[PDB]
Amino acid sequence: GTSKLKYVLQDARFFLIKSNNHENVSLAKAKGVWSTLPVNEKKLNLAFRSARSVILIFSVRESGKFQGFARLSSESHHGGSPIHWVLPAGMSAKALGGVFKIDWICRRELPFTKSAHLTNPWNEHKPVKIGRDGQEIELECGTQLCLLFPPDESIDLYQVIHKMR
Numbered sequence: 001g002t003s004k005l006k007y008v009l010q011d012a013r014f015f016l017i018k019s020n021n022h023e024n025v026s027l028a029k030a031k032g033v034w035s036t037l038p039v040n041e042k043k044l045n046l047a048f049r050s051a052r053s054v055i056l057i058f059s060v061r062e063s064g065k066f067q068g069f070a071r072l073s074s075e076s077h078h079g080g081s082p083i084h085w086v087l088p089a090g091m092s093a094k095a096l097g098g099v100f101k102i103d104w105i106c107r108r109e110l111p112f113t114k115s116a117h118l119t120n121p122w123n124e125h126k127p128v129k130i131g132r133d134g135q136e137i138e139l140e141c142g143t144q145l146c147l148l149f150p151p152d153e154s155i156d157l158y159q160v161i162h163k164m165r
């Protein structure tokens with residue numbers, strides 16, 4: 001069903017993540033971690049303290065799809081297992097040095113063709129697929145986008161809920 005999912009998303013904040021490659025999203029799905037550039041890292045840390053849930057919605061560039069969504073379980077932390085990210089041209093490992101822990105809510109894909117009716121007020125009412133890495137998605141648009149994803153029957157939101165309050 002969708003009731004625990006709606007509960008997790010209630011009063012959540014949503015951010016679009018644009019990965020330049022599939023490799024890093026696969027790593028994030030396997031290891032439960034994400035890193036972003038310093039400008040976005042600061043925004044996510046602020047959001048983590050402000051809301052009951054912060055949701056990252058992932059899209060690999062040129063894939064025409066979202067690859068899933070996850071909830072931040074921590075602020076960014078440096079000084080751990082150095083993650084073997086595939087680095088785009090012009091990006092350091094120190095730039096991706098902040099590592100957020102994430103709990104996946106849905107690891108299934110959603111094609112952009114299925115979200116064409118959703119626009120994001122925080123990005124000039126452009127279709128929600130459009131946005132730079134880190135673009136915040138307004139609550140109602142983000143909730144509806146997350147609810148469009150196919151259910152992921154492999155995930156039990158019980159332990160995710162157990163970390164909220």
Ligand SMILES: CNc1ncnc2c1ncn2[C@@H]1O[C@H](CO)[C@@H](O)[C@H]1O
Binds near residue numbers: 019035
């Ligand atoms: C692990 N983290 C990441 N992996 C791959 N691409 C990323 C990324 N974080 C940001 N990017 C993208 O890299 C671009 C800059 O080269 C940004 O505009 C994002 O779209």
